[PDB]
Amino acid sequence: KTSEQRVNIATLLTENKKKIVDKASQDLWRRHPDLIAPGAFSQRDRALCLRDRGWFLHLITFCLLAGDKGPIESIGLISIREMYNSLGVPVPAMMESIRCLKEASLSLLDEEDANETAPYFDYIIKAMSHHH
Amino acid sequence: KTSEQRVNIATLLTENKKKIVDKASQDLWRRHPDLIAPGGIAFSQRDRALCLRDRGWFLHLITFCLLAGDKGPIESIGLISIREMYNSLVPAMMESIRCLKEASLSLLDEEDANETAPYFDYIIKAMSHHHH
Numbered sequence A: 001k002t003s004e005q006r007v008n009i010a011t012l013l014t015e016n017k018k019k020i021v022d023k024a025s026q027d028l029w030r031r032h033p034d035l036i037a038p039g040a041f042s043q044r045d046r047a048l049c050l051r052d053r054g055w056f057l058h059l060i061t062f063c064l065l066a067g068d069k070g071p072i073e074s075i076g077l078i079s080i081r082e083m084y085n086s087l088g089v090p091v092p093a094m095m096e097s098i099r100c101l102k103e104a105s106l107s108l109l110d111e112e113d114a115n116e117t118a119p120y121f122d123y124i125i126k127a128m129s130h131h132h
Numbered sequence B: 001k002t003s004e005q006r007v008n009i010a011t012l013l014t015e016n017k018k019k020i021v022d023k024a025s026q027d028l029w030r031r032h033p034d035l036i037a038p039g040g041i042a043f044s045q046r047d048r049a050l051c052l053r054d055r056g057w058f059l060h061l062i063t064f065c066l067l068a069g070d071k072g073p074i075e076s077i078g079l080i081s082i083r084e085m086y087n088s089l090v091p092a093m094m095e096s097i098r099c100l101k102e103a104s105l106s107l108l109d110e111e112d113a114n115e116t117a118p119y120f121d122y123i124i125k126a127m128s129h130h131h132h
């Protein structure tokens, strides 16, 4: 399913958007501590990486609202290109970050919603995976 | 976290997106019929489809703001998308939002209309800043 279902899920991912970005950031840094190590070490560069993580979640919930994966093809691609060019973020790092966001988001949902939700995450991963 | 009022407006705009986007399109063509005439920027089926696509995505950005209780989704997704749209390369952009505003507001009582109207206005403002 319903337009109520989409809104139900979107309001969940909005309300808990900080719990998700936090969870997903810890999962990322436990799994890949070389990002948080001296070799996202700086507070300004770690802030941008967190800013960019929250942005991907926003983009997902939007696509969930719209029932549509076209925004990923439109503004998603623009932003992922702008990341590795200007900010030098590696493709494996972004792909893994979105896997961590996926996991954390889905933990709040039930199996009916999570099945409806999971492909939106996967679509961004697939749309990046072709590069590296 | 999300108010009961804003969930309901968000569900109402989402459930009637077709009608709203239909009504916003014909109001735009009524007021500016040159746009879908042989010369104009919405004549060709591609360009008219992209206008239809984008209009609907703006209505979902409004819905998303309502759920956020915040203009954050416009800050996060709106501004970046606006910039890129005009880079592709224009007062029709802003007038289509105004018809979308009035098409949307027409579904709502005065209490709900006053909660939603600012988000349209933020998007009209954000657009105006790309004037030559």
Ligand SMILES: *C(=C)C1=C(C)C(Cc2[nH]c(Cc3[nH]c(CC4=NC(=O)[C@H](C)[C@H]4C=C)c(C)c3CCC(=O)O)c(CCC(=O)O)c2C)=NC1=O
Pocket (backbone or CB within 6 Å): A070, A071, A072, A074, A075, A076, A078, B041, B042, B047, B048, B050, B051, B052, B054, B055, B057, B058, B061, B081, B082, B084, B085, B088, B089, B092, B093, B096
């Ligand atoms: C009618 C007054 C009308 C027209 C003709 C258009 C739009 C339009 N937009 C593009 C490209 C384009 N639009 C956006 C917006 C956008 N992307 C998102 O993901 C957001 C959810 C949404 C904002 C609400 C973007 C980012 C882009 C660039 C990428 C792309 O979609 O191609 C075009 C032509 C593009 C080209 O190929 O040159 C046109 C004609 N909107 C109207 O209201």
